[PDB]
Write a protein that binds this ligand. Structure first.
Ligand SMILES: C[n+]1ccc(-c2cc[n+](C)cc2)cc1
Ligand SMILES: [Pr+3]
Ligand SMILES: [Pr+3]
Length: 392
């Protein structure tokens, strides 16, 4: 007898899935030093784990939304959960870092199911008032994962093997599979209809023609790249770069991702009395000053990692205050299907993350902290350059 508890279990398991796909990245980065050392791979493969994971995350959004609309939101979502489980277990059999990285890419495809079909079902199932509550919980999980992940991941690889992490990801996903199997409704409104890739290609051609949309989408990518670059490389900057331990590594996540949360909590308070664009200008100050301080500090003094951390913290506060607003404006910058717009901007900004982490990596390998931070400053400037057009 499940109908009252169904209204709560369905969003909970999707959030559990969202959480485990997220720590599936955030727990793995600290443990990536163990992985590299166990394959004898070289530290340059540490950020590439995330690069491949995110590259998979942009692989199928365009398809999965309209496909699940045609064949069912249940069978497509459940397939994504199974896929994550199977690919999480398959990585234990990887014989080199290339195979590890390749499965890391296959595991990344699991992210595409969250918004394009999972959240689509939340939109199609719940009232606007309840939908807001669920979206908020999804946002709170997206804030906790990149703080919990590195802390728990650093602690994990001093007692347990990295393999065990993937067992944990598959287990949490397995729990969410059984929960979704019982509780998820079937809310696809086009079951039976034919899907036309040629027609769908025209939809994505039309959104890319929208100048104001593309400007906002790229800006979201550019502005979050410093934060994503830090997540990817902080294990190699702090531990192998600065010759520090796991404690320092983990400790330095607190002011940065704490600052992110602080930026979101203030946004929540200030939202009723500030327009979206004023919050973008408001948050722009800590973003620019933060990135500028981190750059200036590590150019004049290469090993000033506390000044770098403080710079990223001030920057992160700006991101928490500005991003949610810019996401909103970008969505409504294109008067086209919300499924296509969301998939487009999710896809576009992740193109920037994947390429950006790779350039970021080479910046640090060839120039250390100074060139790592300077590249992050360029990204801020590119976000700011786009904002003066996008806003004025
Ligand atoms: C799959 N995925 C999750 C979270 C982000 C994300 C990007 C930028 N920020 C600021 C937060 C979260 C991107 C992709
Ligand atoms: Pr058409
Ligand atoms: Pr269409």
């Amino acid at each position: 007898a499940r109908l009252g508890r169904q209204a709560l279990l369905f969003p909970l398991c999707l959030v559990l899935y969202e959480f485990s796909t997220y720590i599936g990245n955030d727990m793995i980065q600290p443990g990536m030093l163990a992985v590299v050392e166990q394959y004898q791979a070289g530290i340059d493969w540490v950020p590439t784990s995330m690069t491949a994971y995110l590259a998979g995350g942009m692989f199928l959004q365009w398809l999965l939304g309209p496909l699940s609309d045609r064949i069912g939101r249940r069978p497509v979502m459940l397939a994504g959960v199974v896929w994550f489980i199977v690919t999480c277990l398959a990585i234990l059999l990887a014989q080199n870092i290339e195979q590890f990285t390749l499965l890391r890419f296959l595991q990344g495809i699991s992210l595409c199911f969250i918004g394009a079909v999972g959240y689509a079902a939340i939109q199609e199932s719940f009232e606007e008032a309840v939908c807001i509550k669920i979206t908020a919980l999804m946002a709170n999980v997206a804030l906790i994962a990149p703080l919990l992940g590195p802390l728990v991941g650093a602690a994990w690889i001093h007692v347990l093997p990295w393999e065990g992490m993937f067992v944990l990801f598959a287990a949490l996903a397995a729990i969410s599979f059984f929960g979704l199997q019982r509780a998820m409704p079937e809310t696809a409104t086009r079951i039976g209809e034919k899907l036309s890739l040629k027609e769908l290609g025209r939809d994505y051609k039309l959104v890319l023609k929208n100048g104001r949309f593309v400007a906002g989408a790229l800006a979201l990518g550019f502005v979050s790249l410093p934060l994503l670059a830090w997540t990817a490389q902080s294990p190699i900057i702090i531990i192998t770069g600065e010759q520090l331990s796991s404690y320092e590594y983990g400790l330095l996540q607190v002011p940065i991702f704490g600052a992110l949360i602080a930026g979101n909590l203030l946004l929540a308070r200030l939202t009723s009395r500030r327009t979206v664009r004023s919050l973008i200008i408001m948050g722009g100050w800590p973003i620019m000053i933060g990135l500028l301080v981190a750059a200036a500090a590590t150019v004049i003094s290469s090993h000033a990692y506390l000044w770098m951390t403080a710079g990223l913290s001030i920057y992160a506060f700006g991101i928490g205050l500005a991003n949610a607003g810019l996401v909103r404006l970008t969505l409504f910058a294109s008067d086209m299907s919300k499924g296509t717009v969301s998939a487009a901007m999710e896809m576009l900004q992740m193109l920037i993350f994947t390429v950006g982490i790779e350039i970021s990596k080479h910046a640090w390998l060839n120039g250390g902290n100074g060139l790592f931070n300077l590249f992050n400053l360029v990204n801020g400037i590119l976000w700011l350059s786009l904002m003066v057009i996008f806003l004025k």
